[PDB]
Amino acid sequence: ANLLTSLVRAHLDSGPSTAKLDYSKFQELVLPHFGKEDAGDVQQFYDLLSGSLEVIRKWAEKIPGFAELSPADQDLLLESAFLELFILRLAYRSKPGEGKLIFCSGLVLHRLQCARGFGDWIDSILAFSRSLHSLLVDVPAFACLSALVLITDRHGLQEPRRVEELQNRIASCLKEHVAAVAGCLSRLLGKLPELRTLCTQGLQRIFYLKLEDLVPPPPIIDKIFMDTLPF
């Protein structure tokens, strides 16, 4: 499809290639005081979240139809999906066999280097990475699935029919791709409860870090945290 091509283009332009993979901060081995953190570890956690939201914004603007939604619907979709998109894209891009987290900037970081900032949550994201990798989801399928995570019904949409029309198009586009390669779906959905648990673990980690307040969360992440709490 021209839509499939557009979706694949956007996905590949929103991550690093094997070339601009940045090992400047990668330490095979550092020795953390587990179950504690300092201001620099918490700043880095928030900065990674922030960089991923900046990058996901630019990816979304390249999904045909998305830029023509009301600005409020664009924000609402982006906020509502951000955490799930962060986890899924990190899982899909990372190397769980080498305990390597690969962030959208090209930054590579060892599990042990993420432990202070992220706590348990990063161990759980690596577990989901292994899970995801075993389903051998090809790039064009992933490029569609990530878009379906974004372009979905949400309470508060001004133009929900336009969002449902676009969701239809991307669902169609995915169906057509899995027919073109057949000559996985049911098993991908079996992993979705892990992914929702991981979204929750994210909110729990942000709550924990807001309680501790070593450094305050950036305003845009704080707004997503608050706007994403059903109470």
Quickly tell me which residue has 């133009």 as its tokens: 159
- The values of phi and psi at residue 110, to 5°, are -80, 150
Is 11 one of the binding residues for ligand A1D59 (CB under 6 A)? yes
Q: Can you tell me which of 187, 200, 214, 227 binds its own copies, judged by CB under 8 A?
A: 200
Q: Does 92 bind ligand A1D59 (CB under 6 A)?
A: yes
Contact flag: residue 210 with its own copies (CB under 8 A): yes
Partnered with residue 100 across adjacent β-strands are 95, 110
Three-state SS for 101? strand
Residue 110 interacts with, from its own copies, ligand A1D59, none (CB under 5-8 Å by kind) = none
Look up residue 182 and give its two tokens: 């057949």
Return the range that interacts with ligand A1D59 (CB under 6 A); candidates 7-15, 23-31, 111-119, 180-188: 7-15
What mask of x and - would describe binding to ligand A1D59 in positions 40 to 59, judged by CB under 6 A? --------------------
Instruction: Assess 231 for contact with its own copies (CB under 8 A).
Output: yes
> Which pairing describes strands 100-102 and 108-110: parallel, antiparallel, or unpaired?
antiparallel
Contact 87, 49 (CB under 8 A): no
Q: In whole angstroms, give the CA distance from residue 132 to residue 142.
A: 10
Q: Is 148 a binder of its own copies (CB under 8 A)?
A: no
Please give the size of the binding site for its own copies, defined by CB under 8 A: 12
The span from the CA of 30 to the CA of 23, in Å, is: 15
Q: Does 134 bind its own copies (CB under 8 A)?
A: no
Positions that interact with its own copies (CB under 8 A): 200, 203-204, 207-208, 210-213, 229-231
